[PDB]
Design a protein around this ligand. Structure first.
Ligand SMILES: [Ca+2]
Length: 221
């Protein structure tokens, strides 16, 4: 009996990840029976050092992720067991971005210290003017993690088609923190994007270069 055989786990052994990186478990074969998912979850029980609580979310019939309830400690070696499989990974700095819909800001902290690169400009370090989604295409509130980072990626409406310089992806569907030079007059003032968190090129560059996959991004009203 091997229906719950695990092919692979992320983070990989020794990987350097951001402080909210999920534990992603990929099964050798699809678990198509939703009733068998609880048994699979138990087969892949996640035990970390330091201990951490978390919740499973099925991404596909052969992929379950365990989302930690809290941030991993920064600059650390985290020991990880998934079922009997013993591994470890490392965390870099805690690079946390908080988007405020009402304030029109994106606030970046590194290990707790608000910081930004050395038009509206706030003069509180780490507080970047931003522009979130318009009423018809709002930025949804919640807790996200950086899924990928790319340069000069094409984003289209699927009306628009944009070549976007610094793109930090936070949902599978296509929500990003990114550089939005065409949108400068709105930053710190109005929410005129299509759901993405728009920054100036310079702010986006600094944030992109600072953040890692797995770091948290919080959207709040
Ligand atoms: Ca990384």
């Amino acid at each position: 009996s091997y229906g719950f055989a695990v092919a692979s786990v992320l983070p990989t052994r020794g990987q350097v990840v951001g402080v909210a990186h999920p534990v992603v478990v990929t099964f050798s074969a699809p678990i198509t029976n939703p009733a068998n998912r609880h048994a699979a979850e138990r087969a892949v029980e996640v035990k970390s050092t330091p201990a951490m609580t978390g919740k499973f979310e099925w991404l596909d019939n052969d992929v379950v992720q365990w989302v930690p309830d809290r941030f991993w400690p920064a600059h650390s070696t985290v020991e990880l067991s998934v079922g009997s499989l013993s591994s470890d990974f490392k965390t870099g700095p805690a690079v946390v971005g908080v988007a405020s819909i009402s304030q029109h800001t994106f606030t970046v902290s590194i290990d707790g210290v608000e910081e930004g690169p050395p038009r509206v400009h706030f003069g509180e370090d780490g507080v970047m003017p931003a522009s979130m989604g318009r009423p018809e295409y709002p930025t949804p509130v919640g807790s996200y993690t950086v899924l990928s980072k790319e340069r000069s990626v094409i984003m289209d409406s699927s009306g628009y088609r944009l070549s976007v310089d610094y793109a930090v992806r936070i949902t599978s569907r296509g929500l990003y923190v990114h550089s939005a030079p065409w949108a400068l007059p709105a930053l710190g003032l109005e929410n005129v994007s299509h759901g993405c968190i728009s920054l100036s090129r310079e702010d986006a560059e600094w944030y992109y270069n600072a953040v890692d996959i797995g770091d948290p991004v919080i959207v709040q009203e």
